Amino acid sequence: YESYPYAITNPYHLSTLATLFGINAPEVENSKILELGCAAGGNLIPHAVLYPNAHFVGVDLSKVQIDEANKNVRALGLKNIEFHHCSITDIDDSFGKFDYIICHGVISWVPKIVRDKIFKVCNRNLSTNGIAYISYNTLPGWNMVRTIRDMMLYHSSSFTNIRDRIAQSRLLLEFVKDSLEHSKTPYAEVLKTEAGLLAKQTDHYLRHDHLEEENAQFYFHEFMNEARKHNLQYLADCNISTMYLGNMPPKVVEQLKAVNDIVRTEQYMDFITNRRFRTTLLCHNDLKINRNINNDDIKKFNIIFNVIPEKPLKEVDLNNATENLQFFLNGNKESNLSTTSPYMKAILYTFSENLNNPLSFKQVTSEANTKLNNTKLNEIKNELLNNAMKLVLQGYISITNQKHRSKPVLDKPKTTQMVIYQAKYTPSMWVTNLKHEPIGVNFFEKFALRYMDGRNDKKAIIEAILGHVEKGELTLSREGQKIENKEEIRKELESLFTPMIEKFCSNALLV
Amino acid sequence: YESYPYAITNPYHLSTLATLFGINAPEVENSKILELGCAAGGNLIPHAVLYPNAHFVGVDLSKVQIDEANKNVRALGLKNIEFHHCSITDIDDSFGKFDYIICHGVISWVPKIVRDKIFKVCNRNLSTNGIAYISYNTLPGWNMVRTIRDMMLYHSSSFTNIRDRIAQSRLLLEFVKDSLEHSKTPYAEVLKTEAGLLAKQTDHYLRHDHLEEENAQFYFHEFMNEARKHNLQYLADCNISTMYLGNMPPKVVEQLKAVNDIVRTEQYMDFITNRRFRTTLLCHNDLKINRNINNDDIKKFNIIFNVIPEKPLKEVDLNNATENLQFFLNGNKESNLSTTSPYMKAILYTFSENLNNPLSFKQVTSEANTKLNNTKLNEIKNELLNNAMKLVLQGYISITNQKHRSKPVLDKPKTTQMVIYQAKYTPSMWVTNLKHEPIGVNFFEKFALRYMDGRNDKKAIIEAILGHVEKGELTLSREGQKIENKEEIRKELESLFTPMIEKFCSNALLV
Ligand SMILES: C[S@@+](CC[C@H](N)C(=O)[O-])C[C@H]1O[C@@H](n2cnc3c(N)ncnc32)[C@H](O)[C@@H]1O
Ligand SMILES: C[S@@+](CC[C@H](N)C(=O)[O-])C[C@H]1O[C@@H](n2cnc3c(N)ncnc32)[C@H](O)[C@@H]1O
């Protein structure tokens, strides 16, 4: 019962993935967004703060949460969002026509009647050019998760209390990690890791009630068949890399490319890759979508490539073409790309100081062009054009319709309204950034964001945080777990401050 | 659509696992054996030839098969066996009470009503000390088989031909064996193998009607649940090694040993080992079974350990404890065991000349004591006593209630009546041995067995086969590639003869 944002749900990501396929979706700046199964609305409210001219509606069956959502909407003072306590089946054509309909993690947990109704409202209540989003669990991938859920019910059947039946399942998952300690068999690998990721989870799914729930257990084509019954058509997935073919032998790529149905192509890919989950984008049946995508399409979007250089800029010469420089993707150990070309090296160093900041094609191109003394522009353009889209379809590069943001002022840092409201008034250990992603903080950053407005500067902010450490409410961790009253504060804050402002500036927490 | 014997179904194997657990099952020599879903009865008739004083009944729904069964029963002239074309549902209480009821690979393919009936007839028609056998596909193991079968139907629907849609799925399993050519991922392993053993299967399993069939998809505890409704109790599995614990951390063995339930012990092992199949032995609820098994219980049975030494006896000294001798189990490279102990060396060299010939504890012990110069009797006994049961519950050693057989006479070898009928009048490349196992023969072996009666000897048998090669009907080629004159044969017959009499003598094909 903690409401998280899901960045894959952002209406801007749907407008972008549509724009990539040829549909012009409504503008998000002023739109109608619907959320089926909202509450507590952490996937809705942060949008209503950033877009005051759009209209947000949300629907849920738990009154407990719909009241909490309204408790936050009342604290932030928003007029553009309203939450309704009712069921999806209660939505007629009078609700209006929405530009983006977001259904996340519900349609597989509800009875067939509610399913048919969701498929209806994604037709009756969807605009002419609008877009619908539905996430669900698929087969075969879910076969393992179902199995574990059965293995826990069969065990936890010997215990009754809701306080006894949970830690029990948590002890059965440990018992599984013990009996499989020494196993070569390739199956005990999947079971070992899936019980490790289920054991890491907390108490919500693990309640023996949620384990009794039956899942729609879709196959992608059964889902699409119920979708075409309602005159909807498959747009794309929200992870474009899941649609990536090849990374596959070329005779099979040719075969699949021969068949002209994308649905039984994605089905096959589901069968051979053991897909367990899908985030599907649906659009009205009357739209003509274009699947011929070429490198030159990279100019229609703004680009985000989060790469951390392996050596600082002033420490290298880009024209050294024998030097093989490598960059790490949001991280890292391994997960890296190495280039020896001066133009690709100039582009990645531009992407490495713009982290999580959309950049147009002329901004990436011109800003990489001044590291090369303004002479090499056409060679920069020619490498971006060539490798770009190819890297967008593999997932490494993110495209967006969101505009570039002005580099923040770090004199007196200033964060967004949503994260000051989450830092001051909220028990949660994470905040929502401008990209609609939850990012973690440890009580120090949270307290810092409490005081980060365009007013308090470095000194003032630290003295306030210190104010918290006295009444604390505030520990000092390090290596560590000790604080000496004076020598472990105000000399330990000035250390952690600069890099934390780094993390904020590069994670889109500063406006 | 070829009738095969299943050695794991032999009433003597059930009488043996029962004896092992404390139940005295009826004599197999004269009993009442039932088979649900028998025809064409290749799993029944070979028993009716060896036990003329026992009564065999079988039931099947295919007249096409019951006609063949009845024709083979007519060709052998058997009065002790009768086949009925009817349904399991057509069974009265008037059918009698059978000492062994054998249901192999049906209960998962039949509607819930027929399942109810099978569990019923395994109660009302089973004797007081009798035993029932039911094999079925289980979960989780079957999930993969379900996936693949769905993967074929969804594919093969684009054409409706019973002759097209088959070689179609045959080419889809190839499209699967290709697109996974280079893959590390362990799921592509499971899928790689499961499509490989499915493509090796031929034209029947793939019939696309039998892909349309739905499986009961049992869990062991759901099966034991329908068994206890009918007052049946779990006896054991016909693969004793599947009930073996550890191979498992001793804390996990202790934990399972704490809860006393055999059903949820086998259920948890089914969960962690991904059990796909079960051959279950059921017995009446009123019986007291003993699960305490001690090393010295190996004296109640007769022993078969098929080991092929790596060195001839005359080539080694058993008394040398510095020599590490290696033995191969039914084969082989790979599966083998090496021992340096002189007593285990005398026991394994005693089991290696008795292959597939049950041997009592005093025969193994007395014959292994004469290899050590008759000084070691109590040391041989104590090593058999110790390692025996431990190796029986692991699968390496076979126990049986069947008696030792008199060493056959190789002057004029004489094979059993069942394989003479199969050699002469059946176009099968395999015959059924005395242990009820199908064993292959190649065109030479078949022709040889045609003439093996207690009359024809070496020269005569060879002249007969030579006669065949003249009219042949028999192509004899060395590699070689077309021997073939006159005494380049009869010199190839005296060659192929001796190793074949060895092969027959140790496969229980010679009486
Ligand atoms: C299965 S939960 C998933 C919650 C959330 N989207 C997530 O995973 O983070 C679905 C949410 O939908 C709401 N819900 C369930 N059934 C509904 C229905 N029939 N009509 C409207 N809302 C419903 C519930 O309050 C529940 O919190
Ligand atoms: C899987 S095959 C049986 C295999 C069995 N393990 C054997 O080979 O001895 C299923 C056979 O069972 C028979 N059968 C199917 N349904 C039956 C029913 N309801 N009653 C009796 N026999 C049935 C059919 O004749 C079919 O040939």
Swiss-Prot record, chains A, B:
InterPro entries per record: CFA/CMAS, Methyltranfer_dom, MeTrfase_reg_dom_prd, PKMT_C, SAM-dependent_MTases_sf
Gene3D superfamilies on file: Vaccinia Virus protein VP39
CDD domains reported in the protein's UniProt record: AdoMet_MTases (cd02440)
Coiled coil: none
Official protein name in the record: Uncharacterized protein RP789
Gene source species: Rickettsia prowazekii (strain Madrid E)
